Short mmCIF file of C-alpha atoms and ligand atoms in Angstrom, two decimals:
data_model
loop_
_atom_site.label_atom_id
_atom_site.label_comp_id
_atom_site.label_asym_id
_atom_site.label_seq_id
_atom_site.Cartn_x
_atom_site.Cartn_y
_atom_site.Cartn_z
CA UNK A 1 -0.78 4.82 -9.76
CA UNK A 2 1.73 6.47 -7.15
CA UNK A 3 0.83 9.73 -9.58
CA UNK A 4 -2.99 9.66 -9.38
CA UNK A 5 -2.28 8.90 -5.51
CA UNK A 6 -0.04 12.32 -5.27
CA UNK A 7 -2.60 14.30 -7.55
CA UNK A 8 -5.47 13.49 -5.12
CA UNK A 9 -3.42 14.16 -2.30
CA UNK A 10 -3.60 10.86 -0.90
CA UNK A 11 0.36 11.24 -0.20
CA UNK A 12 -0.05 13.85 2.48
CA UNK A 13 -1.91 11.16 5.01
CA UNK A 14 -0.79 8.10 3.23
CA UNK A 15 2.88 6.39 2.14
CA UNK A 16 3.13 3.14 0.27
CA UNK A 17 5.23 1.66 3.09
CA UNK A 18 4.81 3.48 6.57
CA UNK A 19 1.98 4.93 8.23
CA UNK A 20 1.78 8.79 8.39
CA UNK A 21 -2.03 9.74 9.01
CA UNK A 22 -3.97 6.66 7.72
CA UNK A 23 -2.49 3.23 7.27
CA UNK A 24 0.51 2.33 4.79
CA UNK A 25 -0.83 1.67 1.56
CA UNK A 26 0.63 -1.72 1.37
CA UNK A 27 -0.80 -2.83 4.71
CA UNK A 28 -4.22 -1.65 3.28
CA UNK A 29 -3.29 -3.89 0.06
CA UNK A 30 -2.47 -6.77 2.42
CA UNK A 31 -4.98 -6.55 4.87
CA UNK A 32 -7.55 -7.09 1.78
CA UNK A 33 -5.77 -9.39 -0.46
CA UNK A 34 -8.61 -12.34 0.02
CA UNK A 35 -11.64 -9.98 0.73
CA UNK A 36 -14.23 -10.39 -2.38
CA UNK A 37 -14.63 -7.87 -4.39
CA UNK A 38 -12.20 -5.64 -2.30
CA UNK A 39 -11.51 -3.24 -4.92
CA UNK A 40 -15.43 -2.50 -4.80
CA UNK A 41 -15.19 -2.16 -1.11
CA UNK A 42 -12.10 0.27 -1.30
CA UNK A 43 -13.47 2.30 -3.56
CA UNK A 44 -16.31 3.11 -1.81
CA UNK A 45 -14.20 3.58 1.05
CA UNK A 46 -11.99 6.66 -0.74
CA UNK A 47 -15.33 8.23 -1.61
CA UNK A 48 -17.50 7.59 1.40
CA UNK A 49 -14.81 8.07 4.34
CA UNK A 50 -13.64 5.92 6.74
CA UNK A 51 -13.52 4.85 10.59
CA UNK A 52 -12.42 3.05 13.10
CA UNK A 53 -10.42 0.59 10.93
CA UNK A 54 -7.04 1.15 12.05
CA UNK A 55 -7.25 4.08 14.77
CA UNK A 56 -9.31 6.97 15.93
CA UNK A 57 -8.32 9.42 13.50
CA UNK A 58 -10.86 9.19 10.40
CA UNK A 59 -10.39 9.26 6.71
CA UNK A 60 -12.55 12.43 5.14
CA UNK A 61 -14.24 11.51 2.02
CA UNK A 62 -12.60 12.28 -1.19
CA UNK A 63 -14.09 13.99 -3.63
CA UNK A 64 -12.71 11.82 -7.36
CA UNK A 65 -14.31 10.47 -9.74
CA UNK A 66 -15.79 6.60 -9.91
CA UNK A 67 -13.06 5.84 -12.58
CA UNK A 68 -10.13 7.87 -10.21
CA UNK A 69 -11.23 5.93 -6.73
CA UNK A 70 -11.66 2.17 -8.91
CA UNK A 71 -8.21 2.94 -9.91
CA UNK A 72 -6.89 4.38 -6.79
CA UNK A 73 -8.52 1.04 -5.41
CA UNK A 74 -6.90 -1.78 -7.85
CA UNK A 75 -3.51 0.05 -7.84
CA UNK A 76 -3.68 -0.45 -4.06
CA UNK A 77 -4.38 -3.74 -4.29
CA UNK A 78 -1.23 -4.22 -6.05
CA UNK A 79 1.29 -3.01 -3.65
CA UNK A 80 1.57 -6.35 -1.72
C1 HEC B 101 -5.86 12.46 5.66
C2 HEC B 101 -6.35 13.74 5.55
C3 HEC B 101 -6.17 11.38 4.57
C4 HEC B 101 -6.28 11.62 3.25
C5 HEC B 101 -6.10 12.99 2.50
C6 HEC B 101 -6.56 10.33 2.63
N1 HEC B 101 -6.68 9.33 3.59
FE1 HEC B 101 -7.00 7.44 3.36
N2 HEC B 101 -7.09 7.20 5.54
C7 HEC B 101 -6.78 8.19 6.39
C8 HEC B 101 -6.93 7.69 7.73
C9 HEC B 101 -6.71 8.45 9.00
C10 HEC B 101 -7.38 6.26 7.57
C11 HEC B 101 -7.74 5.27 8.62
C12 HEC B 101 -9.23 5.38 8.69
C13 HEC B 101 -9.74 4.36 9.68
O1 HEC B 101 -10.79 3.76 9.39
O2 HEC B 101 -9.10 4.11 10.76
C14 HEC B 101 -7.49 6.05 6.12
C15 HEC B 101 -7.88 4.92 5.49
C16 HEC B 101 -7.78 4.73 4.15
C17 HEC B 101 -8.07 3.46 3.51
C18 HEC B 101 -8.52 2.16 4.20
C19 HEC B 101 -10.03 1.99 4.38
C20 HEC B 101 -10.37 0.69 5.08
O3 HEC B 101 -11.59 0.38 5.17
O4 HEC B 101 -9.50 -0.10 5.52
C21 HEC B 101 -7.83 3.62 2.22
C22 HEC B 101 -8.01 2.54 1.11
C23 HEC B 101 -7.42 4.97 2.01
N3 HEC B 101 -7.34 5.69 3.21
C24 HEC B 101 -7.06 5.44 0.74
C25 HEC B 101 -6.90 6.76 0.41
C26 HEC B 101 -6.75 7.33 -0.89
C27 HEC B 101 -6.74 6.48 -2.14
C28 HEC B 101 -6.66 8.66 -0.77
C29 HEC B 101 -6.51 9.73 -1.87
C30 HEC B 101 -7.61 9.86 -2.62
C31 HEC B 101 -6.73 8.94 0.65
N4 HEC B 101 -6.90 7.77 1.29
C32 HEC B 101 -6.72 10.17 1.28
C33 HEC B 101 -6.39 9.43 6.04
C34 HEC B 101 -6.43 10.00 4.79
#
């Protein structure tokens, strides 16, 4: 939820509706909204890194849990 977000420091890169560092969390949400299993994809995303999607500036990994990144990943999802 926004809290899990803020307690793995997603906040500092990320807000729900504008882009800071990476892209606003509900463009992520809507960007995804018809990819299978997208939550699966997302996940791995927040743990493995990312680049290239939407700029030059990349995403470091994060270092959560599986259960903190799947949730991370399906509250995301939701902010459409
Ligand atoms: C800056 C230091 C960041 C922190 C901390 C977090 N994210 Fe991030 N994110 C950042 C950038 C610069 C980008 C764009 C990367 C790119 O490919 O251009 C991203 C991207 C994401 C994504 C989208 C991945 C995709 O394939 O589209 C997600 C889902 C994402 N970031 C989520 C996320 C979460 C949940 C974080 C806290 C654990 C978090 N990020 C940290 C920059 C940064």
């Amino acid at each position: 939820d926004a809290d899990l977000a803020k307690k793995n420091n997603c906040i500092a890169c990320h807000q729900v509706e504008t882009k800071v560092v990476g892209p606003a969390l509900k463009d992520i949400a809507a960007k995804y909204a018809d990819k299978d299993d997208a939550a699966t994809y997302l996940a791995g995303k927040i743990k493995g890194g990312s680049s290239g999607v939407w700029g030059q500036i990349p995403m470091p990994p994060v270092n959560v849990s599986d259960a903190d990144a799947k949730a991370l990943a399906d509250w995301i999802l939701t902010l459409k």
